[PDB]
Each structure stands twice: as C-alpha cells, then as structure tokens.
Amino acid sequence: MNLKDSIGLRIKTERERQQMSREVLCLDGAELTVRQLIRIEKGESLPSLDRLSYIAKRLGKSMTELLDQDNITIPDEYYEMKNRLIKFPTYRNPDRIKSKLTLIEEVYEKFFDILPEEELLTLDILENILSFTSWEESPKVEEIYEDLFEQVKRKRKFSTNDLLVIDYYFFHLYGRKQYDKKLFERIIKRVLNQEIWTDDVYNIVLFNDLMAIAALKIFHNSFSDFLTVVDKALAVIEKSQLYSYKPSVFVLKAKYELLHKENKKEAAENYDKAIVFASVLEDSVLEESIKAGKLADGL
C-alpha cells in the first residue's frame, strides 16, 4: 500500500458512503473524467491538487480530510528538473536526444510515487515524441492522453502541461492525410491566442507547438493564419531570447512565399536571412542545412 492507494481508498469509501455514482461526481468530465476517477480510486494514479480540490468539493469534504496524514507535496526539485529538461534543446543532435531521454527517465523514476497522472503523462509525451515512438504502440499512455485531451480541447487558456498534451495531439496528426479540420482550426486559434509572458519554459513549449502547426499547415497546403503563426513565433523568440530558433522561422516565411504566394524572389530573400543569421551565430550545421533547403526548393 502506498500514497496512491491510501488516498484512493479514502475517496472511494466516502463516495460510496454518500451513494454517489462516478458519473454524478464527475459531471461533464471537464475537471475529472470517470476513467480518471477509477484510476485514482484503484490507487493507480495520484490526484493532482486540482483534481483533489474538485473531488473534495463534490464530496463536501476538505482536502485535509481526504488527505488525513498523507502528504502529496511535490518537491520543488521535481519542477527544477522538469524545467531544466524542457529548456534542454536537442538541436536534432542524436547524442543530445539520448541525453534528454535519459533525463526524462531519471525524473520519472525518482518522483514516480509522488507525481499525479497529469505530470507522468507530460513526461511520457516528451519521451514518445523525442524517441519518435508511435502513439499506437503506447496504449496505456494513449488511454490517459485521450481523457486529458478531451479536457484540454474544451479550454481556452492553456498551461504548460496543456500545451504538451496539444503537442501530442499534433504528433497524432503527423503525416496523416485524414484529420478533423474543424478541431485542428479550433486548437490552432486558441494556441495563437495564448499570451506570451516571461516564463521561458512555457514559451519554449508554445514555440514548439507553433512550429508543429506551421509544419502541418505546409503539409496540408492550408495557409490561413500562417503569417499569424510566424509572427507569434517571432514574438516568443523575442520574449525568451530564443535566437538559435530564429533562422527556422525565416525558413517558414520562405515556404509561405514559395508555396502560397508563389513568389520565388521573396522566398529566396527569406532563405538568405535565415542563412545569414545562422552564419552570424556561427552555427555551421544549421547554416549548411538551410542552404541545402534553399537549393532543394529550387531557389
């Protein structure tokens, strides 16, 4: 018996004492789904502060009562390590990808017993995306993702964790000819409406979501709001000083000019801005990769 078992049993015992069904407790599932509540009551998942507060309100209990002497405090070292690994750029370098995956597993194992389901899923998302693991081969992660995405897709203000769930949604769309276009537009619009503050962790995750959006729009040949995506990516770069990512945004503007405007001159000029920027950064690997892209696009 661990922390998850003790809290889950307490919640289940009180829910059953009140003769309350899971469906009644969870209402429309916006804050807690039935499967999420089942996993909590079985001791498979720990409730986050937010889920625990919701459950206590529905049961007419205080969080203190539901906790008794149990302590769900997440050590600050967890967030320190999670933030460090989100700010750890791979640059598509396989050695750095492997190091980042090692960091993810380190934090996952060290804090497993004290993390709520949402945090563990966040780590599983990063591992699967970075290792290019098919979501179809990860069925337990997928079941948990499904309900978190049903909750995120109803929101208009996204936390860092929400943006990572959204990143895993974009991962489902990679290379997929068939997709729900109305859902994608809805998600796109809300991501573009997030405010950019001084949270570098948030901004990096937001930036990567914008790049995923841009890449899917090119793939689907759907360029509505594409310049909005470009402008928001540039604003994130400025707020968090993410200058090594700026050439990739100039390359996005080139694709827009080349594929949507069919303006080869302005596409070439945007490629040249990316190349000069990479060169001034003295990032030769990036510079040559962009020069190859310019030539491969016939410019």
Numbering used by the authors: 1 to 299
Which lines from the publication concern this structure?
The crystal structure of the apo form of ComR from S. thermophilus has been determined at a resolution of 1.95 Å in the space group C 2 2 2 with 1 molecule per asymmetric unit. Assembly analysis of the crystal contacts using PDBePISA suggested that apo ComR is a monomer. Size Exclusion Chromatography combined to Multi Angle Laser Light Scattering (SEC-MALLS) analysis clearly established that apo ComR is a monomer in solution, with a measured molecular weight of 41 kDa for a calculated value of 36.5 kDa. In the absence of peptide, the HTH domain is sequestered by the TPR domain of the ComR monomer, generating a new interface of 874.9 Å2. Interestingly, this interface involves the HTH residues R35, R39 and R51, which have been shown to be directly implicated in DNA-binding. In the apo form of the protein, they form salt bridges with TPR-2 residues: R35 with E146 and D147, R39 with E117, and R51 with E118. The residue pair E117-E118, which belongs to the strongly conserved L115PEEE119 motif located in loop α7-α8 between TPR-1 and TPR-2, thus plays an important role in stabilizing the inactive apo form of the protein. Superimposition of the apo and bound forms of the ComR TPR domain (rmsd of 2.4 Å over 212 aligned Cα atoms) showed that the main difference concerns helix α9, which was broken in the dimeric complex and forms a more canonical TPR-2 motif in the apo structure. Interestingly, crystal contacts generate a dimerization interface similar to the dimeric bound form of the protein, with a conserved K246-E282 salt bridge. However, the small overall interface (537.9 Å2) and the poor calculated solvation free energy gain (ΔiG of -1.9 kcal.mol-1) characterizing this contact in the apo structure suggest that the monomer-dimer equilibrium is shifted toward the monomeric form in the absence of peptide and that the dimer would not be stable in the absence of crystal packing forces.
